[PDB]
Ligand binder design. Structure first.
Ligand SMILES: [Ca+2]
Ligand SMILES: [Ca+2]
Ligand SMILES: [Ca+2]
Ligand SMILES: [Mn+2]
Ligand SMILES: [Mn+2]
Ligand SMILES: [Mn+2]
Ligand SMILES: [Mn+2]
Ligand SMILES: [Mn+2]
Ligand SMILES: [Mn+2]
Ligand SMILES: [Mn+2]
Ligand SMILES: [Mn+2]
Lengths: 289, 287, 286
């Protein structure tokens, strides 16, 4: 019943995408009071203050922020609290998972995203480390990232479930096939329904000793989440995502979480941040009946 | 096939929400002509001219009393009463008038909200957040005993569809009193078709069914112009299908369409959708 | 894997609806480069340069005659004809061209409308509301006998998907001729996966299948820029899935994407969606 929130206003990569405004927008949407109202004790750790290379853009700075984030997430779990990380770009998951991995020996990851973020420096069309954060956490990529806060893979391929994917690069599709990553693409979600997708996901991770939720708001359709770094049409509805959070809450398996890629520049009256807060409310136990 | 239409441009409560414009907006969207096009004889009755714990209590009772008698009289004439809403507190008057003609009356409450508050549980004092509870006999005597000193509807004959913004007190009432409610999560899991089949079967023992359709049951993407929008609601397609299934079951014997708010609407499209839903309810088919 | 693309910027009928802008908007959205990215050889044939009961009948026959002969030549060259639309009346010319090479042709009509009117049942005189009926052999002889004095398509080989704005006489035609139609209510009851599986099975005995995709089949939320928007339509997700299922069935031998109207569009997103649906049709997988 105890949560520590940390904001990471990082917007790095080929060009700014505005996702450094995410933590501020989510706070504007009342995330702290929302979780407190459910009955949690909430500790706001604040935001990390963030002060050439084409294949790995802003690598030194990404590594510096992720090292600080990993140690802060590590210490939140040492204190027995739930770490809730608020994102700019999805490369902060490299630091989040490195910190979480200090405390779990068989960690599940649910990656809720339009993208797989499974690129390496060889397969990336852009050099964006936020398009590499899941691959790096699986142990594939640059040593500065893969060995960050620990010289070992933070997550095992058999413990990942990707939900919402619809903009995978060709090299990511090969990785998924060759490595046997469990992926629910939009076409499978249309065929199965989100209820069946979430039951299969929870069953697939039943053996883990904790589960990290890495929720990129661009998993949702731009109609429901216009304010994201890289919008991709054809995504999950608010209703589907809200139901998914409620099913995860009922299963009581989520032990850490991050909500990333909110971009106020493309948002409409902050409504993507408002939606992110509602999804967190559902994740942390709000019920409709 | 005979329908009488009455508008009630009521917008009371803590503050104006703009829903008094609903009847004018729905008429602008051509509701009369649309119903006549289907093959109905339509009589337009026009519009009714209109403390912090029960806000505007005296005025709400006055309007609902007049509405109750007009709805009663429409049914006495053998006609279907269709009520065009401002706020949902007019359901108190509508159900009081309908209850004069049915002793096991069913109600389908299509709404983002339960409207199950009382004086004690309401965080606002808005009577439009109390109209279902009052119609069940729970609430202020001015409301529960309006146009007849008895409960107008039985708890076992209510189905709420669309719920997603229930207060804690309403959740307790639903659980402790056994109200049948399909929240948005249950609709997602079951699908609208199965929700409506179960609803129609649940009300099988009734002698009539009143449809109380609050446009804020639909998602704000499809119905932006409502008094109190709540994200994550029903689609136009789900609602249009639900109306077609009700039409085919031929169980709806009175209806009201409430809470259209032109101030938040986009080129009247919420009112246009309300008319399309009425067209489906009254027998329009796609094939 | 050879495709020939032709644009037909036709916007005839009672009044302008802006659909003559469709081919330019779809090209602006990168249709040619997109098809090439998948691995196709793309020959760009350019654009064709362009009565009250059969409005603009003479001009429609002229354009449709030219389109039919170009479509003929594409199939004769062993290539896939992809037509980019203004009005849906261009289906008359497309199917006339296709039917020279397919005598048991299937047709998937993806549309909010049936386009099953004749000179007698039309409330408007718009030939774009008559193009399916005319291709079935019903209507004026200028259209019915266009580029061939025979019906281009058999009534038993038609599937309409997405219908929600049928005229009363069109409902009668569907009922009295046994036309297979999936309305929005059936799609909502069955789900799009089951609708497409049933569609594919229904056309099992055709020798080819023409996809005639009117963007107003999609809901105006996902496709605001169309000639005649009708609320309550198919989602982008449903349509993208349907295109993928057709791609894997490998039954589509010609296609047209019509009725994109830039005047009502929002930053060209309807044309962008059309290009995305073509990408799915021609083999893109998620
Ligand atoms: Ca804005
Ligand atoms: Ca407006
Ligand atoms: Ca525009
Ligand atoms: Mn440590
Ligand atoms: Mn991501
Ligand atoms: Mn992403
Ligand atoms: Mn009486
Ligand atoms: Mn209500
Ligand atoms: Mn309501
Ligand atoms: Mn058409
Ligand atoms: Mn059409």
């Amino acid at each position: 019943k105890e949560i520590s929130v940390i904001g990471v206003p990082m917007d790095l990569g080929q060009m700014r995408r505005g996702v450094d405004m995410g933590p501020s927008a989510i706070r504007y949407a009342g995330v702290i009071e929302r979780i407190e109202e459910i009955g949690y004790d909430v500790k706001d750790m604040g935001d990390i203050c963030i002060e050439e290379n084409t294949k790995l853009r802003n690598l030194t700075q990404v590594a510096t922020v992720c090292n600080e984030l990993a140690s802060k997430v590590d210490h939140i779990i040492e204190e027995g609290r739930f770490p809730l990380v608020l994102g700019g770009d999805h490369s902060i998951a490299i630091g989040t998972l490195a910190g979480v991995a200090k405390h779990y020996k068989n960690l599940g990851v649910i990656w809720y995203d339009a993208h797989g973020d499974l690129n390496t420096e060889e397969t990336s069309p852009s050099g964006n480390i936020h398009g590499m954060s899941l691959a790096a956490s699986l142990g594939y990529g640059h040593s500065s990232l893969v060995d960050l806060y620990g010289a070992y893979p933070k997550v095992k391929k058999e413990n990942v479930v990707i939900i919402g994917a619809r903009a995978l690069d060709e090299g990511e599709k090969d990785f998924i096939r060759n490595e046997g990553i469990k992926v629910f693409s939009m076409h499978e979600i249309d065929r199965m329904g989100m209820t069946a997708v979430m039951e299969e996901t929870i069953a697939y991770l039943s053996h883990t000793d904790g589960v990290h939720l890495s929720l990129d708001l661009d998993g949702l359709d731009p109609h429901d989440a216009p304010g994201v770094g890289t919008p991709v049409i054809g995504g999950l509805s608010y209703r589907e995502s809200h139901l998914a959070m409620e099913m995860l809450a009922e299963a009581d398996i989520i032990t850490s979480a991050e909500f990333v890629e909110v971009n106020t520049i493309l948002d409409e009256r902050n409504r993507t941040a408002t939606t992110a807060v509602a999804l967190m409310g559902s994740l942390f136990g709000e019920k409709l009946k």
